[PDB]
Amino acid sequence: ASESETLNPSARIMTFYPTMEEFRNFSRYIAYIESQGAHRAGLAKVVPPKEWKPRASYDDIDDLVIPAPIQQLVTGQSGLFTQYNIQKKAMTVREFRKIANSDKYCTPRYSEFEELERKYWKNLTFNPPIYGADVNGTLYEKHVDEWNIGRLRTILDLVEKESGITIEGVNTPYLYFGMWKTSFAWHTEDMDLYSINYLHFGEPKSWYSVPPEHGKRLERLAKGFFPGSAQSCEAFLRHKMTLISPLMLKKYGIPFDKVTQEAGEFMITFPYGYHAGFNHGFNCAESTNFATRRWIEYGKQAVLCSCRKDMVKISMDVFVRKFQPERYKLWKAGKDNTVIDHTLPTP
Numbered sequence: 001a002s003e004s005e006t007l008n009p010s011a012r013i014m015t016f017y018p019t020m021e022e023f024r025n026f027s028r029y030i031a032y033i034e035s036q037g038a039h040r041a042g043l044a045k046v047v048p049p050k051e052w053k054p055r056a057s058y059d060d061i062d063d064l065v066i067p068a069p070i071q072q073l074v075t076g077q078s079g080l081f082t083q084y085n086i087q088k089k090a091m092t093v094r095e096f097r098k099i100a101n102s103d104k105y106c107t108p109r110y111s112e113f114e115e116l117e118r119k120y121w122k123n124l125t126f127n128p129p130i131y132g133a134d135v136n137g138t139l140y141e142k143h144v145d146e147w148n149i150g151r152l153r154t155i156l157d158l159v160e161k162e163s164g165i166t167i168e169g170v171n172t173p174y175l176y177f178g179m180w181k182t183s184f185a186w187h188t189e190d191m192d193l194y195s196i197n198y199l200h201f202g203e204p205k206s207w208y209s210v211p212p213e214h215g216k217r218l219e220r221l222a223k224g225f226f227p228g229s230a231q232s233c234e235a236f237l238r239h240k241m242t243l244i245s246p247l248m249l250k251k252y253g254i255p256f257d258k259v260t261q262e263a264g265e266f267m268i269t270f271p272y273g274y275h276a277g278f279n280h281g282f283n284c285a286e287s288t289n290f291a292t293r294r295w296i297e298y299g300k301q302a303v304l305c306s307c308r309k310d311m312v313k314i315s316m317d318v319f320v321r322k323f324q325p326e327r328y329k330l331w332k333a334g335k336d337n338t339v340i341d342h343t344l345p346t347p
């Protein structure tokens with residue numbers, strides 16, 4: 001009954017191994033994994049067919065510039081933290097790996113991941129690392145026509161197509177150079193879109209994910225822990241400064257799953273899927289957001305941050321008009337009360 005329960009309501013993070021055949025059509029494969037219930041978990045992993053490479057070699061990049069490197073200062077205790085960013089000033093990749101590999105900032109010795117995870121939550125407030133994040137650019141070679149983050153050809157393109165508007169990292173690619181203990185705070189994508197992340201090379205990147213079905217519960221918990229922030233902004237978590245350990249989530253009955261991403265692997269986050277994580281050591285990742293028809297409803301109801309007057313806000317008008325014409329008049333009159341079903345796929 002009700003195909004919904006494909007990912008047997010465990011909303012567990014799933015992993016897929018597509019054939020070069022299925023791997024060719026991006027939009028098609030996303031709809032395919034959703035039919036398998038992958039979206040339930042909010043996060044999913046996709047291993048590319050062995051004979052697939054986005055770039056020949058990553059030897060020719062030490063000269064690449066990281067214009068706005070960031071030092072991450074974390075403050076907090078017993079599972080709850082706030083991350084403050086500090087703009088250092090441009091440096092080259094070559095300069096970055098130096099620091100990343102120095103014993104001052106290199107990965108510690110460990111056996112099992114569970115061990116590396118414990119060390120992360122124990123020392124994240126010590127030795128503020130540097131993260132070469134939000135660097136505009138791609139590392140894909142022009143000919144690569146499979147899963148090219150620079151041109152996925154999803155309907156998110158309608159934004160550019162329609163208004164010429166470009167949003168860095170959103171409808172354009174971003175590169176992330178990290179090192180041990182650099183992390184990304186709990187958050188959903190801008191406008192609750194999907195995101196794709198490819199780990200070009202280096203040490204792993206571990207992820208935590210909360211089923212979108214339970215996203216609202218995570219928010220209530222976060223609100224209770226950071227009441228001051230919750231009042232200064234509707235969606236304070238969008239500030240991407242809040243870190244919450246797996247133990248705190250377990251303690252408060254907030255369902256979640258964890259997964260470690262390795263070089264050459266893709267990660268996909270789904271609409272309203274809250275996620276967070278950290279890098280094991282020196283590595284490089286590329287990402288951008290994308291949309292699907294199933295995303296439209298989420299886009300229409302995404303709660304945006306109010307305080308900051310430079311936050312990402314996309315006009316939904318073109319999507320409702322083109323894919324939901326029968327409801328355009330009603331929506332536009334601010335009286336479309338559609339409820340979202342997080343289990344339902346993109347027919």
Ligand SMILES: O=C(O)CCC(=O)C(=O)O
Nearest residue numbers: 176183184195196197287
């Ligand atoms: O790599 C990071 O620090 C964040 C990546 C991310 O947020 C994403 O891929 O959606």
Ligand SMILES: [Fe+2]
Nearest residue numbers: 188189195269
């Ligand atoms: Fe994200």
Ligand SMILES: [Zn+2]
Nearest residue numbers: 233305307308
């Ligand atoms: Zn805000």
